[PDB]
Amino acid sequence: MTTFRFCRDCNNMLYPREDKENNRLLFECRTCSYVEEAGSPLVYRHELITNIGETAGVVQDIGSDPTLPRSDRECPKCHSRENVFFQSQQRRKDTSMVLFFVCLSCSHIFTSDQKN
Amino acid sequence: DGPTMREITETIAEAKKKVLDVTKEAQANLLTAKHGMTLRESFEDNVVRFLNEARDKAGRLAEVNLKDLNNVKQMVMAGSKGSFINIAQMSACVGQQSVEGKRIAFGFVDRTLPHFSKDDYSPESKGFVENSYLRGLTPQEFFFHAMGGREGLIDTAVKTAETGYIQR
Amino acid sequence: TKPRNSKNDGVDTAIYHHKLRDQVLKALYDVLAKESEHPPQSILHTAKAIESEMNKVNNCDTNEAAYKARYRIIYSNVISKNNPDLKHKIANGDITPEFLATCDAKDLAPAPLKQKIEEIAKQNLYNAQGATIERSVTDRFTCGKCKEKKVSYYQLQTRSADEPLTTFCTCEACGNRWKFS
Amino acid sequence: MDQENERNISRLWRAFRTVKEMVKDRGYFITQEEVELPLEDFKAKYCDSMGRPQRKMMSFQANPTEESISKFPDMGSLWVEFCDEPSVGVKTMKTFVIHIQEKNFQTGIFVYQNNITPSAMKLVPSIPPATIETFNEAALVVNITHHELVPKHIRLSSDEKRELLKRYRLKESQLPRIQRADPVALYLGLKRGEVVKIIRKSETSGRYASYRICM
Amino acid sequence: VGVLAAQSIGEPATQMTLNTFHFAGVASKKVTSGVPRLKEILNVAKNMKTPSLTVYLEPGHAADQEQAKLIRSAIEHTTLKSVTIASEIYYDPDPRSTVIPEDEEIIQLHFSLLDEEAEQSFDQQSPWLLRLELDRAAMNDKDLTMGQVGERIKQTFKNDLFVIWSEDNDEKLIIRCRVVRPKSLDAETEAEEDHMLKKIENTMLENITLRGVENIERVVMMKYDRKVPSPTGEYVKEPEWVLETDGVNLSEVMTVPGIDPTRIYTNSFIDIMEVLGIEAGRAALYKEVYNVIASDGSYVNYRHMALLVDVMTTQGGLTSVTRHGFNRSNTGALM
């Protein structure tokens, strides 16, 4: 997973370059003389289809939203029976109807799909 | 008569239970997507089919109850005014209001009306009228029925002109 | 002590004075004997048998592309670390040289990859189907074509609200359609 | 034996059968056995030791039947020739034209594989009264006339055209018309001012006959 | 009879609006029919909303699903961008060895399986890689063998991209696509490695067709119920497998072996007119008009529709009912 690297001088992103006589990769800033040594042959990455598990999104202070439903399911960690539950907040067309539960006390996230 | 009302309510209840069970199955990632058709579409298709069959069966019970000296039944039998759909709606139940071929979509964010809770998929929350014209409509199903009627009103009012141009 | 190979075992690989055959035999013998405790003589005989079969089923001078493809398939199967048992079998003789000559790429895979392959094939065959428009079943209307009462329905408020709802009935046994209003 | 070899061989055999069907439909004399030649005999005859299709030996001359001559006294022999080059050069077209002219043939069929240079087709209409027609190979694989939606067409003689025109009391500019680039017109090789009869099925009368003119 | 036919056709067209949207009750059947479809038929539009094409298989292969799926794979358009779960542009400075253990196993396979010319061309492989993690399911769906399809056509097209590729048995299907360029490239050119290779990589994903025919986005399997005379003489119902596409290219689908080239049909009568003739176009146009009228349950006698269709296709071509078709005719000036 390629990460942007900024020059330590002027915060500009570092462009790759090659060293033929030593055959090694370096990152240089086109505005200044800073040169740093590349730690991996991985500089860029272009994935096509996202195999990302669906995420509940923002969770902070979600228990104060009064338009969000409730349930009496039991917490797997703190053994509490009060929690908030909602569907996946990522708006893809093909998302399944798998729930997400956020516990009221310990703020623990879990799902209704207990696949082993 | 009262017994016919009893079977009507029982049929409505059993359809509601079937829909609830399908919802429970789909919420646990156990439901299987149908042939060449998304999971959400499969859930919606099951719900719609269940509710429509419930309305039809209740209507047929209420129609079979009626005697021969009923005036509406006499008019329908003669062939002059009405059909069994009219009898079903005035007596058994109105049914499922739709808009553009689908149930009442989410106009707000993740609900259909401020009186519900976010991510609600129950039939009564998505435009199902389980009452009748003789019993009376509650406000939400009244609103959904109003949208259903508005669609056809618009249809007539404009496609008059389009058809006129084509005819000329 | 040392990795067994053509140079280590001191076995000549130039028997048919063919450069391509010589090097492919050397490579296959080395990869077979590197991790095998079996005596080298029967290994060399098996190598001779398999190369003779390769030559006789397909001439290299006329089908060098197919020869290279077959050699690559077999060699990749041999090197495959996921299923070491095969290098036992070819050493043991359980897999006949003719079977390797004729077998496809799939069958040489281990059992878990096989099972995944049939599962993928079944899922694809299921996913190539179209949308099935299953309609509500009822037994009241009589069809005019085959007179089988298994006629589906659909009813809606489509005509002008000055008139009642409109129903359309389609026979699922013959394909007849009609309207009532 | 790469798959592309037998794929191309099969498509070429299909095109050959379709061309034979077309020549038979134009009124010429072709036996039924020759139309139904199995691909094994085709491979045995028109392939070399390496399996390369030898198109140059497929050129043949056809002659009209007794019936066609009786209906069309002006009809004459036809020649058909295939071209091996992926693109037809000017010299090849000139050689084919000269061969047709010295054979004194009234019409010829020149089937090309991929493309023809503009200078080559410059010579197409330069040999009256002979007619030169070209058929791209990719468009002769499947016979168009064998579809279900295509009714059966027939060509009409001068006498039949005159009799119809008198009987319906018409001038030729009032009949329905059919273009030149129409695929069935190319199949039948209709020229300008020729009338084609159509036989069709009908829910109301069973059979119905229409007429059209090539414009 | 002209005004009689026009009135007969266009009176139910006025009431047709009401029940047009019954097919709106099926969301997955978003196919134009009703008022817009009749409008498009009359205008002879050259860009339909939803073109389609229905293919009927051979008599022998009709009852079995397997030959049907082979044909379906042989028809649908397959391109490289569709078959790569990760066609990731990676830095490939020294293709001799890598840090990732997964590709290391594949390394020694071909490094002991490359010819002398490949040994010479080792230096031609780009300092960047198209590293292809290829999805197993998508590759097996189209019956696509890794080696032959992956490399034969790709290297034959322009001799532009060579590959180190593994046999399908590895758990992670990894291909190393390394483009091939002459060493005679200019110093300024050779410095701008990324500049050439990103562009050629995009032109590589987008413009390489592994298998199929162009413009056909989807092909789908369906089961239908034909009626056939039984050997005793009566008519019996018999099932069959057909292929319905989403997108039309009739000149190339017609010649694919393994189908019935005498029962193919599409709802785009202009293509039928171009390929099969004008009478075929007339029959297809009649089927379209009759379908759109009768899909509402209304009945209009045959003579009216026959007259309209004959008028629309009497000049040797499709003459639309607009000013461009009728007001450009040869009729009287005041008319």
Tokens standing for residue D17? 């059968």
**Partners of chain E (3+ Cβ pairs below 8 A):** A, B, C, D
A7 and A54 housed in the same domain: no
Q: Which domain holds residue A27?
A: 2-46
Residue whose pair of structure tokens reads 């002659």 in the numeric block: D63
Residues of E with Cβ-Cβ distance to A41 under 8 angstroms: 90-94, 98-99
Alpha-carbon span E106 to E163, nearest angstrom: 12
Token duo for residue D143: 């016979």
Q: What determination technique applies here?
A: cryo-EM
Contacts of C139 in chain B (CB under 8 A): none
Q: How many CB atoms lie within 10 A of CB E30?
A: 11
Does the annotation place A105 within a ligand binding site? Answer: no
Q: How far is C49 from chain E (nearest CA, A)?
A: 21
- Give C-chain residues touching E244 at CB under 8 angstroms: 130
| Minimal CA separation from E130 to chain A, in Å | 10
| Torsion sign (Cα): D189, D192, D194, D200 | positive
CATH code where residue D82 lies: 3.40.1340.10
- CATH number reported for the structural domain that contains residue A103 in this entry: 2.20.25.10
Judge if A51 and A71 occupy the same domain: yes
Question: Comparing C-alpha atoms, which of B56, B53, B47, B134 is closest to residue B90?
Answer: B134
Residue B89: exposure state from Cβ atoms within 10 A (0-12, 13-18, ≥19): buried
Residue C17 backbone class (left: φ over 0; alpha: ψ -120 to 50; beta: rest): left
Nearest chain E residue to D185 by CA distance is E277
Is A66 marked as binding a ligand?
no
CB contact under 8 A, C161 and B83: no
Distance in angstroms (rounded) separating the CA atoms of residues D190 and D184: 9
- Token pair for E200: 């050629």
d(CA E134, CA E132): 6
C-beta atoms of B111 and A67 within 8 A: yes
Contact C95, C78 (CB under 8 A): no
E19 contact residues in C (CB cutoff 8 A): 156, 158-159, 166, 168, 179
What is the rounded CA–CA span in Å between residue D139 and residue E251? 8
Nearest residue to E250 (alpha-carbon basis) of E264, E240, E263: E264
- Do A37 and A51 fall into the same domain? no
Would the annotation count A75 as a binding residue? yes
A106 annotated as belonging to a binding site for a ligand: yes
**Contact (CB, 8 A) for C92 and C44:** no
User: Are E1 and E307 spatial neighbours (Cβ–Cβ below 8 Å)?
Assistant: yes
* Cross-chain Cβ contact B163/E21 below 8 Å: no
Do D100 and D177 lie in a common domain? no
Angstrom distance (rounded) from CA C150 to CA C143: 8
d(CA C154, CA C168): 5
Q: Note whether A71 and A111 are same-domain residues.
A: yes
Q: Which of E25, E72, E298 sits opposite C154 (nearest CB)?
A: E25
- Interface check E199 vs C, CB under 8 A: no
C and A touching (3 or more beta-carbon pairs closer than 8 Å): no
What 3-state DSSP class applies to D142?
coil
Q: Do B34 and C131 touch (CB under 8 A)?
A: yes
Picking from C136, C161, C180, the nearest residue to B152 by CB comes out as C161
Cα separation, C54 vs E35, whole angstroms: 67
Measured between alpha carbons, how far is residue E295 from residues B163, C142, C164, C170, D213 in Å? 17, 19, 20, 11, 36
Which amino acids of C are annotated as binding site for Zn(2+), given as ranges?
143, 146, 171, 174
**Six-digit token pair at C63?**
């089908």
Residues in chain C: 181
Q: Do A13 and A57 belong to one domain?
A: no
Chain D positions touching chain E (beta carbons under 8 Å): 10-11, 138-139, 141-142, 144, 146-151, 176-179, 182-184, 198, 200, 203-204, 212, 215
Q: How many residues does chain D have?
A: 215
Rounded distance between C-alpha atoms, residue D214 and residue D102, angstroms? 31
| Test the C interface: residue of E113, E146, E219, E298 with most C CBs within 10 Å | E113
Domain limits at D94? 2-142
Least Cα distance to E177 among E108, E116, E126, E142 occurs for E126
SS3 D112: strand
Q: What is the CATH number of domain E78-212?
A: 3.30.1360.140
- The CA radius of gyration of chain A, in Å to the nearest whole number, is 23
B1-138 sits in which CATH class?
mainly alpha
| Residue D132 and residue D122 in one domain | yes
Q: Give the best residue of E279, E299, E318, E330 to mutate against chain D (max D CB count within 10 A).
A: E279
- Same domain, yes or no, for A52 and A41? no
Contact E174, E102 (CB under 8 A): yes
Compute the distance between CA of residue A96 and CA of residue B26 in angstroms, rounded to an integer: 8
Contact predicate E111/C76, CB 8 Å:
no
Helix (DSSP H) and strand (DSSP E) numbers for chain A: 0, 7
Cβ separation B167–E10 shorter than 8 A: yes
Q: Are E236 and E45 in contact (CB under 8 A)?
A: no
Chains in touch with A (≥3 Cβ pairs < 8 A): B, E
Write the secondary structure of B96-165 as one string of H (helix), E (strand) and C (coil): ECCECCECCCCCCCCCCCCCCCCCCCCHHHCCEECCCCCCCCCHHHHHHHHHHHHHHHHHHHHHHHHHHH
Is C176 at the interface with chain B, CB within 8 A? no
Inspect the interface and report whether the beta carbons of D142 and E284 lie closer than 8 Å: no
Q: CA-to-CA distance for E93 and A44, rounded, in angstroms?
A: 13
Angle between helices C64-79 and E101-111 (to 10 degrees): 140
Select the residue of D149, D177, D198 nearest E315 (Cβ to Cβ): D177
Domain count, chain A: 2
Residue carrying the six token digits 């049907």: E68
Q: CA–CA separation, C68 vs E236, rounded Å?
A: 54
CA E179: distance to chain centroid? 29
Structure tokens at E252: 């190339």
A39 and A69 housed in the same domain: no
d(CA E312, CA C139): 44
Given CA atoms A34, A38, A39, A42 in this order, what sign does their dihedral have? positive
- Tell which of D123, D142, D161 closes a domain: D142
Out of E263, E264, E277, the one facing D183 most closely (by C-beta) is E277
Residues D57 and D95 in one domain: yes
Enumerate the β-bridge partners of residue E89: E130
How far off is chain B from A59, nearest CA to CA, in Å? 16
Question: Which residues from D are below 8 Å from E277, CB to CB?
Answer: 144, 150, 182-184
Interface B:C, Cβ pairs < 8 A = 45
Nearest-5° Cα angle at E58, E56 to E64: 90
Q: How many domains in chain D?
A: 2
State the Cα–Cα distance between residues E212 and E77, nearest whole angstrom.
4
Cα A15 to Cα B106, D189, E13, E201: the distances in Å are 48, 68, 66, 20
Contact B149 C157 (CB under 8 A): yes
Q: Is B137 left (phi over 0), alpha (psi -120 to 50) or beta?
A: beta
Which of A18, A41, A49 lies at the smallest CB-CB distance from E85? A49
Q: Quote the minimal CA–CA distance from E261 to chain D in Å.
A: 7
Subunit contact E25:B98, Cβ cutoff 8 A? yes
Q: Do residues E74 and E257 lie in contact, with contact meaning Cβ atoms separated by under 8 Å?
A: no
Give the helix ranges, DSSP H, for E277-318: 278-294, 302-312
Same-domain pairing of D160 and D117: no
SS3 E10: helix
Locate the chain E residue with the closest alpha carbon to C156.
E22
Using the beta-carbon criterion (under 8 Å), do A87 and B119 form an inter-chain contact?
yes
